[PDB]
Amino acid sequence: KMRDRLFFLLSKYGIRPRDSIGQHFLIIEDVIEKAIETANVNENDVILEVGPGLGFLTDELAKRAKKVYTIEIDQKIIEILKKEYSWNNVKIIQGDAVRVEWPKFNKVVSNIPYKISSPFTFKLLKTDFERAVVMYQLEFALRMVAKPGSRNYSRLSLMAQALGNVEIVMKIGKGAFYPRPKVDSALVLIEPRKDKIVLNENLVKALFQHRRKTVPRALKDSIHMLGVSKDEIRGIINNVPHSNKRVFQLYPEEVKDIEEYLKKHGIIS
Ligand SMILES: CSC[C@H]1O[C@@H](n2cnc3c(N)ncnc32)[C@H](O)[C@@H]1O
Ligand SMILES: Nc1ncnc2c1ncn2[C@@H]1O[C@H](CO)[C@@H](O)[C@H]1O
Ligand SMILES: NC(=[NH2+])NCCC[C@H](N)C(=O)O
Ligand SMILES: O=S([O-])[O-]
Ligand SMILES: O=S([O-])[O-]
Ligand SMILES: [Cl-]
Ligand SMILES: [Cl-]
Ligand SMILES: [Cl-]
Ligand SMILES: [Zn+2]
Ligand SMILES: [Zn+2]
Ligand SMILES: [Zn+2]
Ligand SMILES: [Zn+2]
Ligand SMILES: [Zn+2]
Ligand SMILES: [Zn+2]
Ligand SMILES: [Zn+2]
């Protein structure tokens, strides 16, 4: 049925899906219903959506939320949304979601275009939001929920899990989109922690530059003789918390220990 509505609109408006901007439209209603339901959308919520496409998720959000902001890069798609729908409570913003200024919202409920997965997510993690329910390329989702010590645990994994509980709610087959992409998707829930861990970006980048290294080794390669001599640096590294771990095995809390330790010895400010 939603599939039927897609084919109706494609020929009604002469839409040519563009792969330059990864145009793959969700056509499985169960996936939209699961997103909405996970998001627990209520009449007080202000929702951010990226890449509304033909508006199938947008429409479900508009009927339940106080307001939806939706960011769309394709001007033609915007014109179609304006003609096809009549919402009283949706503001369409034109631009690349990675570049434009975001409005204030408390929840994101969105398909995420494959090509902006990383910059969208890092931008999101620097925002105040109560809940995020976002569809990612499966491989990127797996990266986001990867555990410390796993092969794909990376800076993204750490920063996202530092901010929130991150989990995969469902896998979404490629057959769920028209045109059919070459990758699967996953629905990801991000539940911001009461106990938010806020980590120094510079420490994290330095550590994760070579994340297979032991913590002492990565610190040895990052610490300069800036208000601290060679022997002082050797003393500092000798007593670093979590000296027995490699970087890729660190929880957010353990990075925080290293950060607080470096702060007390003068190395960060
Ligand atoms: C549903 S496929 C992605 C949808 O988001 C749009 N889109 C793709 N890339 C971006 C982006 N960087 N910012 C906003 N919308 C985007 C596409 O035009 C399509 O409607
Ligand atoms: N002695 C230092 N004082 C201040 N910042 C430093 C010092 N040594 C390294 N840093 C910065 O902190 C990062 C994490 O250790 C390093 O890559 C570097 O940018
Ligand atoms: N590695 C050196 N610079 N050695 C010279 C003596 C350093 C001195 N024993 C110290 O620990 O402060
Ligand atoms: O694909 S957009 O140009 O409607
Ligand atoms: O290796 S750390 O947890 O002590
Ligand atoms: Cl694509
Ligand atoms: Cl409706
Ligand atoms: Cl050095
Ligand atoms: Zn059909
Ligand atoms: Zn594609
Ligand atoms: Zn249900
Ligand atoms: Zn409607
Ligand atoms: Zn890949
Ligand atoms: Zn390396
Ligand atoms: Zn140096």
Curated annotation (Swiss-Prot):
Record flagged with keyword Transmembrane: no
Keyword list, A-Z: Cytoplasm, Methyltransferase, RNA-binding, rRNA processing, S-adenosyl-L-methionine, Transferase
UniProt keyword Hydrolase, yes or no: no
CC annotations in GO: cytoplasm
Name by which UniProt lists this protein: Probable ribosomal RNA small subunit methyltransferase A
Transmembrane segments: none
Pfam families referenced in this protein's UniProt entry, alphabetically: RrnaAD
Subcellular location: Cytoplasm
UniProt-listed PROSITE patterns: RRNA_A_DIMETH, SAM_RNA_A_N6_MT
GO molecular function, one term: RNA binding
Function: Specifically dimethylates two adjacent adenosines in the loop of a conserved hairpin near the 3'-end of 16S rRNA in the 30S particle. May play a critical role in biogenesis of 30S subunits.
InterPro entries hit by this protein: KsgA/Erm, rRNA_Ade_diMease-like_C, rRNA_Ade_Mease_Trfase_CS, rRNA_Ade_methylase_Trfase_N, rRNA_adenine_dimethylase, SAM-dependent_MTases_sf
EC number, UniProt record: 2.1.1.-
Domain of life where this protein originates: Archaea
Binding residue positions for S-adenosyl-L-methionine: H24, L26, G51, E72, D96, N111
Record family assignment: Belongs to the class I-like SAM-binding methyltransferase superfamily. rRNA adenine N(6)-methyltransferase family. RsmA subfamily.
